[PDB]
Design a protein around this nucleic acid. Structure first.
Length: 360
RNA sequence: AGCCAGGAUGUUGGCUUAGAAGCAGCCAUCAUUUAAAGAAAGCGUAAUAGCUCACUGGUCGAGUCGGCCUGCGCGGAAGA
RNA sequence: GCUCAACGGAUAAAAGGUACUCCGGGGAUAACAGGCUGAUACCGCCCAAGAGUUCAUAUCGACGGCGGUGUUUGGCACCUCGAUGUCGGCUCAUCACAUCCUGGGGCUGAAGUAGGUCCCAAGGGUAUGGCUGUUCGCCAUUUAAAGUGGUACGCGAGCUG
RNA sequence: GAGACACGGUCCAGACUCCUACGGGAGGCAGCAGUGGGGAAUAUUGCACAAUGGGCGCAAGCCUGAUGCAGCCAUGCCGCG
RNA sequence: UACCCGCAGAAGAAGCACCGGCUAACUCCGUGCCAGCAGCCGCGGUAAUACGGAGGGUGCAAGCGUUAAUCGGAAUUACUG
RNA sequence: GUACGGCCGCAAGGUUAAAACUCAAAUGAAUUGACGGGGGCCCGCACAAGCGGUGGAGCAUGUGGUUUAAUUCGAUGCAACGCGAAGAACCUUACCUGGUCUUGACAUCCACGGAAGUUUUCAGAGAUGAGAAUGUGCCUUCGGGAACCGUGAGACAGGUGCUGCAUGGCUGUCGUCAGCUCGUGUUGUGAAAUGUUGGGUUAAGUCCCGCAACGAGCGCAACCCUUAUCCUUUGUUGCCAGCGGUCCGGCCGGGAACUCAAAGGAGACUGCCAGUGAUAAACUGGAGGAAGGUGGGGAUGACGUCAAGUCAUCAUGGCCCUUACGACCAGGGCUACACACGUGCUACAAUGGCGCAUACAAAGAGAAGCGACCUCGCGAGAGCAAGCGGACCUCAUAAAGUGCGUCGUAGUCCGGAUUGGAGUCUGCAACUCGACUCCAUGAAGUCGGAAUCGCUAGUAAUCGUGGAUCAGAAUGCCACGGUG
RNA sequence: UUCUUCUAAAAAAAA
RNA sequence: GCGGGGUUGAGCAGCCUGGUAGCUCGUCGGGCUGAAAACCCGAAGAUCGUCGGUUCAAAUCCGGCCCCCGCAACCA
């Protein structure tokens, strides 16, 4: 919302002033660690605050211009000044958008988009198909490639769950805000009595994490131990050690092998099992982390968990995280997501700056 | 080889950095005062800075420096 | 006229078990232990890209290189098959230093306390229990410390089974 | 002791609190206020024996946190503004 | 002390719950199955007399609502029944 | 009727018998509908018997999807898909990109200055910026009076923006199916029932009889339009039976009979007869009659159903924009194209193609219009040009048919798609994106899978003609006749 | 002779 | 160490004596149903695990390799 963003920018301006004063004080540089972050804070804050201050002057200029138009018969000059002011206001807002554009390297990474049906059943499945088409057309518009990793089709059409990988530039940055539940208010195709039914769908956007690497076991890291094997076998089994226990000291994993009579074969088998166990532990840790992140991002599937609502009879799209209602639903359905995505990016960056200001 | 003095300049070279000045790092590494002085070899700072220093002059006034073909030696060299 | 193919062809005609075994031999030939060697094992050293905010060498050290010991698993079959008893435990030890503690010292990314690493030094000391036949290992609680090894992986004409 | 197996009487054992010269002692608010604690929650460490009543005394009189009052609380009932 | 007489001045003295039906008392604006209400039936999903605020109204009044607990309604342990 | 506990049993288990938690209901009988792969009776191209198609091919048109700056919006089972659109070059146009305006393109009111009106001039794609000639139609205490412009301020205008799930009006649909109700009375505590059911009958809840029902209303039939027969009035621009003439042409004197043109009337009502039937309603058959039981066709659509369709015909409550979601102009888009579907046109051929000769229509339209005749062009058409506001003149010679000739089962003398060259007409302007003509070119197609549609008589099938829309632009739509 | 299934939001009056 | 295997998206035939790729389920487009299944019609698909070698020609033949499935890894 415009009022909310202007309010945040004002608070940032106050923060910027406080940072300049704190920098001037020299107590922070004595601290050193405090000054370094504060100086970065100032760097990011100064450009946006300067732009905002200029915008503030422009808004004041518009108020005075309207007043000038009403009384001294200076209406013609005021109308031109006001018109110029409007042009300036629009240009400053585009500049603000540029200043608040995300600079994070992580944002550029490609992403996996999973759309799953929630409440509504086949209806929700159809909406999932609509959402997938929406995002696909948006990706196509911005020159991205969509690969359908997995698909589970609905009975009456649509997809019960479709997982796709989108590869491009700035995919994660552009699409991170879509995650969460999405509510669709419409008259279902499956319906025969013309009733309107509120249904919900859960979307998860996950960034493509760096490719898994299996590090080769380091000899110094391993602590091989040779000991006598248990069981039958006579003099040879008693004198020859024939059993190897390798403990990986960083991960604290112990593998014991006494199968073959040869120590070399026992050691080889133990090394293989140890490598598999480390690879399994890493893989499991990744799955647990991936599952937890997905679990948090995805909603419960109920109508209550929402981040966007699409009302089809009245053609209205509403964003719940930051207030914004748009009476469209056709342009947005046919790609053109930028109008919705951008205010969220700008607000998120402002929130991030505020969080950075508050970190101690 | 010691001793004494210097080793300034444009400019804090250009970047990017929250700072980058010789030093986190990427490219040049030019030019002047010309008895020489380095877009600087490092220490060092939180960056500058400060110190040693690549090079220039008196001093004592006889050799000095590191490569080649070779003989013989030193360390590397710890067990019941 | 024979895939008599085990191809100078034992017959035209034939598979297994022995820990219930047994005889004649071989250390001509294996398992234990000893011997030679050292691939493998363990411990060092040479060059220094890099980790260490800057800085290779405080501490580590990639890609590669050269050794020492006999020390794990081996390679060979030189000793023994007209008998060289073998894993672990108990009792009793003795030696080496590549030192676990105490002693002396250099550097430290050593403020102090407490540490890291290396050099010198074997005079003395170097746990008790739970689990398993266990060596090894994990765990509980101490200790200045709970060393690594050699001695037929010491020791059954001393004990166990 | 007429009446107790006796709240402010005796003895023993147990838990707790306090004094100690370490040998040994003292105590029991479920009396009136009152303090920590528990709980959603419940009051003042007040005045007087002037009246009623109890104990002693021949009586005057003394004692009575019983009792009569006062302080806090809209806790309830009733009346008025 | 109760009580009585005189002095100045309308000053020093009104709040709580509810209004879709049960249940007496209705409209407007913000929000769009969100925030929320609720003792039961049940409201709210961008025209809410049911949420929140305002105006108006209804019931009580130094009190007003909510909660806990018992009986009634419950002839829903019935002897009456 | 489960867990735990007790008792019984060889076991399966039996018997006695809770609690926590959860919901504001669970249940019984009966009533009105709806449904049954329940029963009985009846109807409709619903099935059966046939004819011709669609799905296969090319093209026209509409939709979904996709592409795009936009491919404008709406409809989407029957009841959307040759649908709104009864006609997209600009216009329409609501969409896109640019160039422009802010009391405005379109209304009312106020103030000021000009009558309006008229031709030209440069810049710009144009929208609108600049520039010269003209004038006065109204009354007169003639500071004024009507329109029609320009400037300023406002109240206001403006919206094909959203909500048909807030609506009016209008329409589809079950379905022209025969049903849907009410007043009073009665039965049941009551929702309800009866009437409206039953026996016959009908196309029909049409009619009769019976009957706790008696009546009434909206509907199912009739009254309305058209067609079929006859009579009276009227005979021109319509007709020619009898005559007189003819350039042989109803053409000209004429004639009012006939076709035909309208106006009025007659006629078809189970009216008559026989049989069946309940002495009824009614049904079957024939006599006359052009027509027999509703003679054929149409208009006519009950209470209601689908929150069906339309806020984009219009009107309208509320929400949204007011230097723009309003307004003007040029150019583009609605005509895009890997694909899928709906409705058609032309075909795959001999019941035919081509060439010549020849016969018979109906119903319409026409003044910014239909346009004879003659001349030119192979042709679409062009020039001159009478007649006609139309029973007169024009569109306009109907085609299939018939007679003759050729083709001889072939991707063909079938079929015309596609493409190149040259033109005509409309319109400021045929590139995207019109219709038609000439020459050349001659794809697929040899009767079509699963499936599916229309039709019971002048119907299906087939062949042409006209009209609305319209400056031009139909294979669609609405009518008309020929064979059948 | 066989012939299964259709989730999840509606609104209806008060002499 | 030894036998067998790798074939359209999945499970599997046939690799035959080296010139030649098949089935079921699945997939795509129509049809039925008001709609989704089931059903009907018409289609499509592979560099036969990897790399060298002998042929005119290798999925087939040879050799090496990777993965999968069995068998064995015993006397001390």
């Amino acid at each position: 919302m415009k009022s909310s963003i202007v309010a945040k920018l004002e608070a940032l301006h106050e923060r910027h002033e406080e940072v300049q004063a704190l920098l001037g004080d020299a107590q922070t540089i004595a601290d050193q660690e405090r000054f370094r972050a504060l100086s970065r804070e100032y760097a990011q804050l100064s450009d946006v605050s300067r732009c905002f201050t200029d915008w503030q002057q422009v808004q004041e200029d518009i108020e005075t211009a309207q007043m000038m138009l009403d009384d001294p018969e200076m209406r013609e000059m005021a109308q031109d000044e006001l018109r110029e002011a409007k042009e300036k206001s629009e240009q400053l807002e585009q500049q603000l958008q540029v200043l608040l554009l995300p600079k994070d390297p992580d944002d550029e990474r490609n992403a996996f988009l999973e759309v799953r049906a929630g409440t509504g059943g086949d209806e929700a499945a159809l909406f999932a198909g609509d959402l997938f088409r929406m995002y696909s057309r948006y990706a196509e518009a911005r020159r991205w490639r969509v690969e359908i990793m997995s698909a589970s089709e609905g009975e009456h059409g649509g997809y019960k769950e479709i997982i796709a990988k989108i590869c491009g530039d700035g995919v994660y940055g552009r699409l991170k805000f879509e995650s969460g539940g999405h509510r669709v208010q419409r008259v279902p195709a499956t319906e025969s009595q013309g009733r309107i039914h509120t249904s919900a769908c859960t979307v998860a956007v996950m960034p493509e994490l760096p490719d898994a690497e299996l590090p080769d076991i380091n000899p110094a890291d391993l602590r091989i131990d040779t000991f006598r094997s248990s069981g039958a076998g006579g003099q040879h089994v008693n004198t020859t050690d024939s059993a190897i226990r390798i403990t990986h000291l960083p991960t604290g994993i112990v593998v014991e092998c006494q199968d073959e009579r040869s120590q070399h074969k026992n050691k080889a088998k133990a090394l293989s099992v140890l490598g598999a166990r480390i690879h399994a532990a890493e893989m499991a840790k990744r799955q647990q982390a991936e599952a937890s992140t997905r679990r948090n991002l995805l909603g419960s599937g109920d109508r209550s968990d929402r981040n966007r609502t699409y009302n089809f009879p009245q053609g209205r799209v509403t964003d719940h995280r930051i207030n914004l209602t748009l009476y469209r639903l056709d342009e947005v359905m046919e790609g053109k997501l930028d109008m919705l995505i951008e205010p969220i990016i700008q607000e998120h960056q402002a929130d991030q700056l505020a969080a950075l200001s508050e970190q101690e």
